Amino acid sequence: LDFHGQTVWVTGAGKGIGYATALAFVEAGANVTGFDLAFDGEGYPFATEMLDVADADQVRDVCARLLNDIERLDVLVNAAGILRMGATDQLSAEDWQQTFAVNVGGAFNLFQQTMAQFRRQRGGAIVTVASDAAHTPRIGMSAYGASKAALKSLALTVGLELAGSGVRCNLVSPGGIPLGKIARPQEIANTILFLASSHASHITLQDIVVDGGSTLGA
């Protein structure tokens, strides 16, 4: 999978799946910009933008400024996300609010700021990290799964809104079933790179669940 010369944006890039995906794109030759609230790790071999992707004004300022400097946004990866668990009637107001602000609002803001670019360039790919909790109800994850279901629905309608522009828009949903150990970020990133690649050129509005089969196909 070769991404030489391509411009790639990744949110949630300070840690977890976003970091692994940014790194995988850098190793595949891409020019990568990572977005996250904090960059507290010891090494980032890509350009970083430290902001709250849940904040519509911050995303507007930064993305408008960067789009003024690039010719093409080849790949957007939405990988921001937080997990706050609890019985539905015990979850705090803060955990409910922040779950939706980050897990749905972040991608919404990125979409608001990039859809015109995707339309005007024709083409490109978007991959959004959802969750298998969006596919089946999971005790303790009512808010998390609901936020990821909103995110998936949003990303699919964006994919329909951009299909006439030739943009591909897909999702990955991370976690003897489960089959194997839980998937590492490095392996989620492999699936994102596949969906971002020319080897997936007629794949859009799809969601690959990468959880060892735990949803039994749902």
mmCIF file of C-alpha atoms in Angstrom:
data_model
loop_
_atom_site.group_PDB
_atom_site.id
_atom_site.type_symbol
_atom_site.label_atom_id
_atom_site.label_comp_id
_atom_site.label_asym_id
_atom_site.label_seq_id
_atom_site.Cartn_x
_atom_site.Cartn_y
_atom_site.Cartn_z
ATOM 1 C CA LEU A 1 0.000 0.000 0.000
ATOM 2 C CA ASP A 2 1.701 3.119 -1.346
ATOM 3 C CA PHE A 3 0.638 6.645 -0.403
ATOM 4 C CA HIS A 4 3.702 8.521 -1.673
ATOM 5 C CA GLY A 5 3.003 12.197 -2.204
ATOM 6 C CA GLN A 6 -0.520 12.069 -0.809
ATOM 7 C CA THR A 7 -1.797 14.485 1.847
ATOM 8 C CA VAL A 8 -3.425 12.693 4.789
ATOM 9 C CA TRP A 9 -5.192 14.146 7.835
ATOM 10 C CA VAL A 10 -5.773 12.002 10.947
ATOM 11 C CA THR A 11 -7.705 13.041 14.060
ATOM 12 C CA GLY A 12 -7.079 11.439 17.426
ATOM 13 C CA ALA A 13 -3.478 11.199 16.300
ATOM 14 C CA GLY A 14 -1.805 11.654 19.697
ATOM 15 C CA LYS A 15 -2.401 8.075 20.847
ATOM 16 C CA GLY A 16 -4.314 4.879 20.166
ATOM 17 C CA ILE A 17 -5.727 4.067 16.742
ATOM 18 C CA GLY A 18 -5.186 7.552 15.364
ATOM 19 C CA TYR A 19 -1.510 7.522 16.275
ATOM 20 C CA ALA A 20 -1.011 4.067 14.790
ATOM 21 C CA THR A 21 -2.797 5.169 11.615
ATOM 22 C CA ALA A 22 -0.789 8.384 11.221
ATOM 23 C CA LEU A 23 2.438 6.417 11.680
ATOM 24 C CA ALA A 24 1.328 3.789 9.165
ATOM 25 C CA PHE A 25 0.619 6.517 6.586
ATOM 26 C CA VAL A 26 4.013 8.178 7.216
ATOM 27 C CA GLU A 27 5.689 4.805 6.652
ATOM 28 C CA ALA A 28 3.672 4.415 3.425
ATOM 29 C CA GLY A 29 5.116 7.705 2.159
ATOM 30 C CA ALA A 30 2.298 10.118 2.956
ATOM 31 C CA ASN A 31 2.566 13.726 4.122
ATOM 32 C CA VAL A 32 0.604 13.446 7.354
ATOM 33 C CA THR A 33 -0.952 16.026 9.669
ATOM 34 C CA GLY A 34 -2.269 14.713 12.999
ATOM 35 C CA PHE A 35 -4.941 16.441 15.103
ATOM 36 C CA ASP A 36 -5.578 15.832 18.788
ATOM 37 C CA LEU A 37 -6.309 17.558 22.093
ATOM 38 C CA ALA A 38 -2.951 16.521 23.535
ATOM 39 C CA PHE A 39 0.303 15.202 22.083
ATOM 40 C CA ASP A 40 1.758 13.736 25.266
ATOM 41 C CA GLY A 41 3.748 10.928 23.612
ATOM 42 C CA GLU A 42 7.504 11.012 23.128
ATOM 43 C CA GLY A 43 7.563 10.953 19.309
ATOM 44 C CA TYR A 44 5.491 12.319 16.428
ATOM 45 C CA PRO A 45 7.077 11.958 12.942
ATOM 46 C CA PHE A 46 4.361 14.054 11.372
ATOM 47 C CA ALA A 47 3.002 17.558 11.640
ATOM 48 C CA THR A 48 0.755 18.098 14.654
ATOM 49 C CA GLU A 49 -2.170 20.416 15.336
ATOM 50 C CA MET A 50 -3.151 20.539 18.980
ATOM 51 C CA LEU A 51 -6.792 21.537 19.344
ATOM 52 C CA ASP A 52 -10.169 20.260 20.494
ATOM 53 C CA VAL A 53 -11.784 18.681 17.431
ATOM 54 C CA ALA A 54 -15.123 18.962 19.307
ATOM 55 C CA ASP A 55 -14.789 22.773 19.087
ATOM 56 C CA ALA A 56 -16.256 24.063 15.849
ATOM 57 C CA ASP A 57 -14.446 27.418 15.922
ATOM 58 C CA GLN A 58 -11.015 25.910 16.557
ATOM 59 C CA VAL A 59 -11.470 23.372 13.777
ATOM 60 C CA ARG A 60 -12.644 26.092 11.399
ATOM 61 C CA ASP A 61 -9.639 28.304 12.032
ATOM 62 C CA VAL A 62 -7.036 25.587 11.745
ATOM 63 C CA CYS A 63 -8.536 23.693 8.812
ATOM 64 C CA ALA A 64 -9.166 26.864 6.809
ATOM 65 C CA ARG A 65 -5.531 27.863 7.356
ATOM 66 C CA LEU A 66 -4.161 24.453 6.308
ATOM 67 C CA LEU A 67 -6.436 24.203 3.253
ATOM 68 C CA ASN A 68 -4.958 27.532 2.117
ATOM 69 C CA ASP A 69 -1.595 25.742 1.871
ATOM 70 C CA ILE A 70 -2.418 22.334 0.348
ATOM 71 C CA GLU A 71 -3.651 21.493 -3.147
ATOM 72 C CA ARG A 72 -5.415 18.249 -2.312
ATOM 73 C CA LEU A 73 -6.637 16.423 0.765
ATOM 74 C CA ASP A 74 -6.191 12.809 -0.362
ATOM 75 C CA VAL A 75 -7.336 11.030 2.818
ATOM 76 C CA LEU A 76 -9.232 12.109 5.933
ATOM 77 C CA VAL A 77 -9.218 9.672 8.838
ATOM 78 C CA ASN A 78 -11.634 10.403 11.678
ATOM 79 C CA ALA A 79 -10.163 8.544 14.645
ATOM 80 C CA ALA A 80 -10.918 10.758 17.634
ATOM 81 C CA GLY A 81 -12.920 9.165 20.366
ATOM 82 C CA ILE A 82 -13.352 8.706 24.091
ATOM 83 C CA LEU A 83 -14.814 5.824 26.069
ATOM 84 C CA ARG A 84 -16.868 6.589 29.181
ATOM 85 C CA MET A 85 -18.723 3.574 30.548
ATOM 86 C CA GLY A 86 -21.502 3.209 33.080
ATOM 87 C CA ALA A 87 -25.038 1.975 33.591
ATOM 88 C CA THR A 88 -27.330 4.302 31.693
ATOM 89 C CA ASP A 89 -28.877 5.736 34.858
ATOM 90 C CA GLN A 90 -25.496 6.215 36.588
ATOM 91 C CA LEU A 91 -23.588 7.966 33.808
ATOM 92 C CA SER A 92 -22.678 11.545 34.667
ATOM 93 C CA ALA A 93 -23.860 14.563 32.705
ATOM 94 C CA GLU A 94 -20.229 15.342 31.873
ATOM 95 C CA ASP A 95 -19.558 11.856 30.496
ATOM 96 C CA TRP A 96 -22.720 11.953 28.391
ATOM 97 C CA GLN A 97 -21.994 15.418 27.017
ATOM 98 C CA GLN A 98 -18.302 14.890 26.328
ATOM 99 C CA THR A 99 -18.966 11.503 24.700
ATOM 100 C CA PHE A 100 -21.190 13.125 22.083
ATOM 101 C CA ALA A 101 -19.120 16.285 21.668
ATOM 102 C CA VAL A 102 -15.980 14.306 20.812
ATOM 103 C CA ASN A 103 -17.280 11.092 19.285
ATOM 104 C CA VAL A 104 -19.845 12.739 16.960
ATOM 105 C CA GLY A 105 -19.138 16.458 17.004
ATOM 106 C CA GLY A 106 -15.468 16.073 16.106
ATOM 107 C CA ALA A 107 -16.195 14.313 12.827
ATOM 108 C CA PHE A 108 -19.086 16.661 12.146
ATOM 109 C CA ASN A 109 -16.738 19.619 12.434
ATOM 110 C CA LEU A 110 -14.091 17.972 10.225
ATOM 111 C CA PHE A 111 -16.786 17.220 7.634
ATOM 112 C CA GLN A 112 -18.070 20.793 7.743
ATOM 113 C CA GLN A 113 -14.568 22.063 7.052
ATOM 114 C CA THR A 114 -13.485 19.564 4.371
ATOM 115 C CA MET A 115 -16.540 18.736 2.271
ATOM 116 C CA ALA A 116 -16.020 21.730 -0.029
ATOM 117 C CA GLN A 117 -12.405 20.656 -0.585
ATOM 118 C CA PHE A 118 -13.451 17.086 -1.450
ATOM 119 C CA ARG A 119 -16.064 18.412 -3.874
ATOM 120 C CA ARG A 120 -13.716 20.890 -5.551
ATOM 121 C CA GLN A 121 -10.832 18.417 -6.005
ATOM 122 C CA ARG A 122 -13.045 15.481 -7.033
ATOM 123 C CA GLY A 123 -12.016 12.280 -5.353
ATOM 124 C CA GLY A 124 -10.245 11.251 -2.209
ATOM 125 C CA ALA A 125 -11.120 8.909 0.591
ATOM 126 C CA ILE A 126 -12.537 9.208 4.083
ATOM 127 C CA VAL A 127 -12.287 6.541 6.745
ATOM 128 C CA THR A 128 -14.078 6.908 10.081
ATOM 129 C CA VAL A 129 -13.379 4.814 13.193
ATOM 130 C CA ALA A 130 -16.676 3.712 14.753
ATOM 131 C CA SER A 131 -17.003 0.739 17.130
ATOM 132 C CA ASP A 132 -18.618 -2.660 17.313
ATOM 133 C CA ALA A 133 -20.666 -1.106 20.117
ATOM 134 C CA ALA A 134 -22.568 0.681 17.363
ATOM 135 C CA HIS A 135 -23.566 -2.717 15.932
ATOM 136 C CA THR A 136 -25.003 -4.496 19.012
ATOM 137 C CA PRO A 137 -26.135 -3.317 22.455
ATOM 138 C CA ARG A 138 -23.441 -3.639 25.093
ATOM 139 C CA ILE A 139 -24.091 -3.302 28.815
ATOM 140 C CA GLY A 140 -22.124 -0.422 30.266
ATOM 141 C CA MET A 141 -21.610 1.266 26.872
ATOM 142 C CA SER A 142 -25.044 2.728 26.204
ATOM 143 C CA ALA A 143 -23.732 6.253 25.562
ATOM 144 C CA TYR A 144 -20.527 5.150 23.849
ATOM 145 C CA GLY A 145 -22.347 2.864 21.451
ATOM 146 C CA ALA A 146 -25.036 5.450 20.788
ATOM 147 C CA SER A 147 -22.406 8.080 19.943
ATOM 148 C CA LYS A 148 -20.663 5.632 17.614
ATOM 149 C CA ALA A 149 -23.990 4.799 15.942
ATOM 150 C CA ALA A 150 -24.569 8.500 15.320
ATOM 151 C CA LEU A 151 -21.046 8.792 13.967
ATOM 152 C CA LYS A 152 -21.586 5.890 11.579
ATOM 153 C CA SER A 153 -24.896 7.310 10.353
ATOM 154 C CA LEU A 154 -23.349 10.742 9.851
ATOM 155 C CA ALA A 155 -20.364 9.348 7.953
ATOM 156 C CA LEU A 156 -22.634 7.338 5.622
ATOM 157 C CA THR A 157 -24.811 10.325 4.750
ATOM 158 C CA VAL A 158 -21.670 12.401 4.164
ATOM 159 C CA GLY A 159 -20.562 9.560 1.919
ATOM 160 C CA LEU A 160 -23.782 9.871 -0.047
ATOM 161 C CA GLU A 161 -23.417 13.671 -0.178
ATOM 162 C CA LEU A 162 -19.898 13.268 -1.656
ATOM 163 C CA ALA A 163 -20.440 10.241 -3.871
ATOM 164 C CA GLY A 164 -21.127 12.412 -6.916
ATOM 165 C CA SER A 165 -17.677 13.934 -6.397
ATOM 166 C CA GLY A 166 -16.039 10.521 -6.576
ATOM 167 C CA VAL A 167 -15.172 10.408 -2.879
ATOM 168 C CA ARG A 168 -15.056 7.039 -1.121
ATOM 169 C CA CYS A 169 -16.297 7.052 2.486
ATOM 170 C CA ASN A 170 -16.064 3.966 4.687
ATOM 171 C CA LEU A 171 -15.745 2.932 8.324
ATOM 172 C CA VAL A 172 -13.855 0.574 10.572
ATOM 173 C CA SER A 173 -15.514 -0.684 13.779
ATOM 174 C CA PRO A 174 -12.978 -1.979 16.318
ATOM 175 C CA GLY A 175 -13.706 -4.102 19.360
ATOM 176 C CA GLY A 176 -14.390 -19.702 20.026
ATOM 177 C CA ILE A 177 -15.590 -16.136 19.471
ATOM 178 C CA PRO A 178 -13.888 -13.660 19.747
ATOM 179 C CA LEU A 179 -11.469 -15.368 17.345
ATOM 180 C CA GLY A 180 -7.992 -14.390 18.499
ATOM 181 C CA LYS A 181 -6.718 -11.675 20.788
ATOM 182 C CA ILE A 182 -8.247 -8.197 20.714
ATOM 183 C CA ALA A 183 -7.079 -6.220 17.696
ATOM 184 C CA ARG A 184 -4.129 -3.923 18.297
ATOM 185 C CA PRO A 185 -4.224 -0.374 16.894
ATOM 186 C CA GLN A 186 -1.511 -1.379 14.410
ATOM 187 C CA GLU A 187 -3.913 -3.901 12.905
ATOM 188 C CA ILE A 188 -6.848 -1.470 12.818
ATOM 189 C CA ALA A 189 -4.563 0.903 10.929
ATOM 190 C CA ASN A 190 -3.917 -1.816 8.322
ATOM 191 C CA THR A 191 -7.656 -1.930 7.619
ATOM 192 C CA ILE A 192 -7.913 1.861 7.418
ATOM 193 C CA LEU A 193 -5.017 1.977 4.944
ATOM 194 C CA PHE A 194 -6.728 -0.698 2.852
ATOM 195 C CA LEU A 195 -9.955 1.307 2.714
ATOM 196 C CA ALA A 196 -8.029 4.482 1.898
ATOM 197 C CA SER A 197 -6.148 2.789 -0.936
ATOM 198 C CA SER A 198 -6.725 2.318 -4.655
ATOM 199 C CA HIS A 199 -7.269 -1.351 -3.862
ATOM 200 C CA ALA A 200 -10.673 -0.228 -2.408
ATOM 201 C CA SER A 201 -11.647 2.028 -5.326
ATOM 202 C CA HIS A 202 -15.221 0.732 -5.706
ATOM 203 C CA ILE A 203 -15.862 0.299 -1.975
ATOM 204 C CA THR A 204 -17.935 3.016 -0.327
ATOM 205 C CA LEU A 205 -20.472 3.283 2.508
ATOM 206 C CA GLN A 206 -19.024 0.082 4.029
ATOM 207 C CA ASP A 207 -18.133 -0.627 7.666
ATOM 208 C CA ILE A 208 -15.601 -3.393 8.416
ATOM 209 C CA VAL A 209 -15.950 -4.778 11.962
ATOM 210 C CA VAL A 210 -12.565 -5.784 13.316
ATOM 211 C CA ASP A 211 -13.335 -7.561 16.596
ATOM 212 C CA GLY A 212 -12.664 -11.243 16.050
ATOM 213 C CA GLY A 213 -16.249 -11.899 15.054
ATOM 214 C CA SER A 214 -17.839 -10.799 18.350
ATOM 215 C CA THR A 215 -20.947 -9.332 16.683
ATOM 216 C CA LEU A 216 -21.489 -12.556 14.717
ATOM 217 C CA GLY A 217 -21.769 -10.549 11.531
ATOM 218 C CA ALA A 218 -23.977 -7.751 12.844
#
